[model samples]
Target: ALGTLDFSLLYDQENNALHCTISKAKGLKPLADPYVKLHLLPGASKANKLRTKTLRNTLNPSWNETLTYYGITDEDMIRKTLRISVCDEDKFRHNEFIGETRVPLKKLKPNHTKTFSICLEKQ
Candidate 1:
């Protein structure tokens, strides 16, 4: 697992949609916390933000979960971008912003899934 986040992306050509698989995370200095979040912009808004569930209690967790963003058009892929955030979630404190990655949807080949392991950046 890489806290940088080992993930994958797939764009639906037929449906004009997109999905992301947040496979796992590691190298975290945390209270054993976790989450993978998505922001598609113009703006990063809570109304459109999406999150992967907590991966229980550990600094390193493997989620292997595929999450989706429906109703994304090819136009959106050309014009919009996906911002992925990594964090730690706990009951007592606000989530820690560990790192993030920005990806252009236009890079995705329709119907092809590409695995990506990116370097995390301090946000």
Candidate 2:
């Protein structure tokens, strides 16, 4: 069921934040319901886990939404990482596990909009 997930990244140094846009997932295997979780690690707030709205009953789901996370300074972002997990949402039970990808913030550039076609891997 491994496929390609498309997303974009932008860093706001002036506001000490990281902005992301999750466009969609392509070539995914059929599932009951699908959704994505954008997990910001090492610098994200512990109380909240950023996630996209569920895309129901589709192999390819389009979620053109922008997510922003504040409190990330330039120095703090140097060692932070982003983990995007693609999962199946369940109405009456636990969500099904799918695949994910991790990205290091050190490789990211500020003010540059970089789109990624990241491949999913089992964690």
Candidate 3:
């Protein structure tokens, strides 16, 4: 059985508030490895990349999983950007992009829930 899930992310630049929610997925089976790709900006000093994922289960099958790539940066310069693309089994054929989101230097604050979505097809 396949069901729809509601996922959302709220980020307030003024109050610096972050909220994340993943509706609920009845069945979530990742055929392939799930990961995130963090691309760095050109000519940026001390660039870093991070990857995060959540364990698939029944209760938290489609729970809201948050990934905080950065903590705090003093520079606060728009020197880096990121695109999150998820993949499934079949390196080529079944490899469909779940979703992609960008992260700029401006939104790098204390807490932020940069959420993205991807659906698994019935096999």
Candidate 4:
């Protein structure tokens, strides 16, 4: 099944932070609690990850949450892309993957917000 993610990004030159705002998601399978997760591409580790609050039992969940990576320079954005992932949060087991999209950091303007509603590819 195809999925889509609604989100935004902003680079703050003053604070050197990369701000990612996850708005909502659409077209996921039925009967699961969903949440958004963040990762910076080019490498994989827990230190590069951030996540939002899990919502209860919804296919289309509205997060409206901002996850930020602090002390990120302009050069870092050019060298990296943000990984957005949606998953079903479970207590008895590990989180289940829904889908993901990698947003390239090169196109953002400092202090200005950029938004996207793109197809979330299966991973």
Estimate TM-scores for all models.
0.88, 0.91, 0.38, 0.92
Local distance difference test scores for all models: 0.81, 0.81, 0.40, 0.87
Give Cα distance to truth, residue 69, candidate 2, Å: 0.2
How well does candidate 4 score on lDDT at residue 73? 88
- Tens-digit lDDT track of model 4 for 2-71: 5778999999889999888899988776377889889888758787899999999888889999999997
Better of 2 and 4 by lDDT: 4
On lDDT, the leading prediction is 4
On TM-score, who's better, 2 or 3?
2
RMSD of each: 2.1, 1.7, 7.6, 1.4
TM-score of 1: 0.88
Judged by TM-score, which candidate is best? Answer: 4
Candidate 2 clashes: the total is 0
Superposing every Cα of model 1 onto the true structure, what RMSD results? 2.1
Question: What is the Cα-based lDDT of residue 70 in candidate 4?
Answer: 90
- Over 1-123, each residue of candidate 2 has an lDDT whose tens digit, in order, gives 587899998888888888889999887753657788887777356533788899888878899988888887787568778988888888988888677898788878888878899878888
Which portions of model 4 show Cα errors greater than 4 Å? none
Q: What's the C-alpha lDDT at position 14 in model 1?
A: 89
What residue runs in model 2 are displaced by over 4 Å at the alpha carbon? 43-45
User: lDDT per residue, candidate 1, 1-123, as tens digits?
Assistant: 235678999998788778889998767654567888988876555755888888767777788888888888888888888899888776786777778888888888889998898877877
lDDT of 3 at 108: 50
Number of clashing residue pairs, candidate 3? 2
